[PDB]
Amino acid sequence: QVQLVESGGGVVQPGRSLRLSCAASGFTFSSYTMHWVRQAPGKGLEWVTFISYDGNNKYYADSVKGRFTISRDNSKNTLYLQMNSLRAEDTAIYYCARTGWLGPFDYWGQGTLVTVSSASTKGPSVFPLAPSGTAALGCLVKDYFPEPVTVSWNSGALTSGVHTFPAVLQSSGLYSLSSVVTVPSSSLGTQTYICNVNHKPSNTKVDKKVEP
């Protein structure tokens, strides 16, 4: 039916520029007004900017006035957000949204993620969390950037009992993460438990055997 498709997300350093685009189909584009709405990691929704059908009325939240530019090209059915002088606090998923005739945001795009950090791509350091009826052992996946990271146990052969925690952001700009799994303690001497950690942005995959 009516679809909104967003394209422009990515990872950039602070102070830089980045243009988001929202291609729209399934309706007459130039008859509705459009919005950008952003959502920081683990936080609520926040209205960003508004544009009318004509293009002669643009409104901006105080967070972004003077740095963000909303625009639309009806001949291509596209809404744009030019983001300038980017700050770390701008890190969020950005949605385009349509205002129905009646007033609310009736159709939302799928969301592009935008990350603003001064860190450089960095593979993680992996350390074993050794164990000592049921026992626990795990993996410390430390000091990587950016998200995400894929953790698997025994190459995916071990899924029952696995907890991979969400990454906490450290003061350095790098993320850190822990994955654990509980096992029958009777297996610590016989079964081998190998951490598998994949960080696609840095081109690093490593395996760490975890032992008493």
Binding site: G111, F127, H163, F165, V180
Partner: protein, 214 residues
């Protein structure tokens, strides 16, 4: 500077039970230009209610909105598994299109006490010059717990970080990991490392510990 305040922050019910979510406005939404949105985990929001009582096209009948002035309510009459999400209220039509901070509806189960584990820093980490001590709270409910670290019975503060899983799909519990950061020099000075956990399901706080180098 209108503030929409949603309550409660988190709402914990069993499946099949009725859910009531509230949105209080700092000033009156005289137009009743109030919307409710559903955001399922990992998805963009979808409009549920507009004009504060009008069901959007293609929304199940169990969702319903009511209220006026400064107080609006969203009612989910029979919580299906797909209904356990976060819900935002919104005033539209005017200056900031302000949102509420959101209400999360999670699955209610009986209390579960966490299984506690402590992990000493690995030799590999120490060889790199850092020391991380990890305490794990496994499969507990409800989500609120507190973890205290004691290095030789000295209470730490400001040097630990904690992450929490989302509600498990099979048994609706939570898991928590706490990571104490010390300098390698500090870790080598003291002997006994303990994490002390307090939780609803524990009669008295459970303490798991280890002495360094053993």
């Amino acid at each position: 500077e209108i503030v929409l305040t949603q309550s409660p922050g988190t709402l914990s019910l069993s499946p099949g039970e009725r859910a009531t979510l509230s949105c209080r406005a700092s000033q009156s939404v005289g137009s009743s230009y109030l919307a409710w949105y559903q955001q399922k985990p990992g998805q963009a929001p979808r409009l549920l209610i507009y004009g504060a009582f009008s069901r959007a096209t293609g929304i199940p009948d169990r969702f319903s909105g009511s209220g006026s002035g400064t107080d609006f309510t969203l009612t989910i009459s029979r919580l299906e598994p797909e209904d356990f999400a976060v819900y935002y209220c919104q005033q539209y039509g005017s200056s900031p299109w302000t949102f509420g901070q959101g209400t999360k509806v999670e699955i209610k189960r009986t209390v579960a006490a966490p299984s506690v584990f402590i992990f000493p820093p690995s030799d590999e980490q120490l060889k790199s010059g850092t020391a991380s001590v990890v305490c794990l709270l496994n499969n507990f409910y409800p989500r609120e717990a507190k973890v205290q670290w004691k290095v030789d019975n000295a209470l730490q503060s400001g040097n630990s970080q904690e992450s929490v899983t989302e509600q498990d799909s099979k048994d609706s519990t939570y898991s928590l990991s706490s990571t104490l950061t010390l300098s390698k020099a500090d870790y080598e000075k003291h002997k006994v490392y303990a994490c002390e956990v307090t939780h609803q399901g524990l009669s008295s706080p459970v303490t798991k510990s280890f002495n360094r180098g053993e």
